Symmetry: C3
Subunit: 204 residues, 3 copies
């Protein structure tokens, strides 16, 4: 009995190690799928702008929303007649975001540009906001660049966040781009000045 | 010493069960997110079902056929401005029509639903929303129930995987099986009268 | 302790079974990701070897004028080191991508300011790999003047009996040669049959 039982234990331990290993390779594929989903949501949303702070209106259909979109243009960047939209719609004191899906990505990029060169954008004198529309995960990665961004800003590096969630800044007469925080760590680990500045923020 | 090895094995087993449940939740999230992005990408599209196909076709022949369907079934819809198509192609195979504006896809779908019986040269065809296989299958699992609700303004939605929800009494309700829906409607005369035939009641 | 080991074995068996069910859904998801990436990228063409500097759209028209006499709506054109990045041209109609690719494959050489560049498809990783894997079979069929072609997503087509036949994958082609002996003899080893 002690023989049949010891052999039953050994087999089980071996099946356990097999399971842990299959688990690791399964984990790797799920992660790869999660990253691929984030990327495709980002890709498919590229033609999209989020309009934030625009007052709700009664029986507000697509024609009304385009008309409002044109009022925003006239008030902030007049020369930016009719711009091409695949779709536009809202997503209770606080008005819902409007998601504007352009026919051509170039139109989305030109309106973003004009908005970031203008600083304050307004509809009838009150501040509205224009931003990109991204997967939840990328949106979060941008937010988490927050602390590092502010440090770089404070210390004259001219930071930017761009698509998808890349931080960029100047380092040696040149714009450097960092796709994620690990690619930044591997860059600062070489520059001492930058390293002591970002050490805590990079959780290095 | 056996007892030691058994304890150790039981502990490793508990760790694997939890890891496994963690992975299962993420696999489910990924499945749901795939259903959503398929639905999202197909928003500008309609499926045109039952259209006779030819030995060889291209975009131009198919677009002239869409024009015939419009002229034959809802001409006024195209009176003031032409229907803007971005592209049209086969997957008699389904034809996928991709509109420039989602607004136009919606206008045409509505005219089809309000005409009832859409034909091409006298023969019945169908215009329908284009969706992920999952969402389509979910809507068929609910059958006519889903469409009666749509047609009476109840805002029905599929939620992953195949749950039905809609709004009644100013509250969103979710249903997993038809049985749950039956239980719910036995108390609502307005809603009961509408869905009885459809819930096999 | 026998009860405890029997129970552990039951747990292990449940974990393995529940693991294969999970594994099949991971596979399902991987395949579904392949298909949605192919679908979304279907009107895309990739430009390789174009030097770095509306300008991109201008460059596209430049390439078109310089190379393809007969031959244009775009949804997006964008760049993806010393080597210039690829340019992804996202056409409005899949048909335009196809015509650009045909004209490139026919002209056999494509140039910008007289320097050779490459036009190619832009598809999921899995599908690009599937195309590359038709290589050995494509090469053989080309040699024997079967006029083979690889097209969307990863289908092989070629002339058999004056008629073009299409193969979604290698299994479909194996099934096809089970009843054509000379063709089977030709592709037997390439098909790992
Ligand atoms: Cl997964
Ligand atoms: Cl697992």
């Amino acid at each position: 009995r002690c023989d049949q039982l010891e052999e039953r234990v050994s087999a089980a331990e071996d099946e356990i190690n097999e399971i842990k290993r299959e688990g690791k390779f399964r984990e790797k594929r799920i992660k790869r799928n999660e990253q691929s989903l984030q990327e495709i949501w980002d890709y498919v949303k590229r033609p999209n702008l989020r309009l934030i702070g625009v007052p709700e209106s009664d029986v507000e259909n697509g024609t009304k929303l385009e008309n409002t979109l044109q009022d925003i243009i006239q008030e902030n960047f007049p020369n930016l007649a009719n711009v091409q939209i695949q779709e536009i719609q809202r997503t209770r004191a606080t008005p819902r975001h409007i998601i504007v899906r352009f026919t051509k990505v170039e139109m989305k990029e030109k309106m973003l540009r004009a908005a970031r060169e203008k600083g304050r954008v307004t509809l009838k004198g009150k501040p509205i906001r224009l931003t990109v529309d991204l997967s939840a995960e990328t949106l979060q990665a941008r937010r988490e660049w927050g602390p590092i961004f502010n440090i770089l800003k404070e210390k004259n590096f001219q930071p930017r966040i761009s698509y998808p969630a890349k931080l960029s800044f100047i380092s040696e007469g040149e714009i450097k781009y960092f796709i994620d925080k690990q690619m930044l760590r591997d860059f600062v680990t070489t520059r001492p000045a930058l390293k002591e500045l970002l050490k805590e923020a990079l959780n290095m």
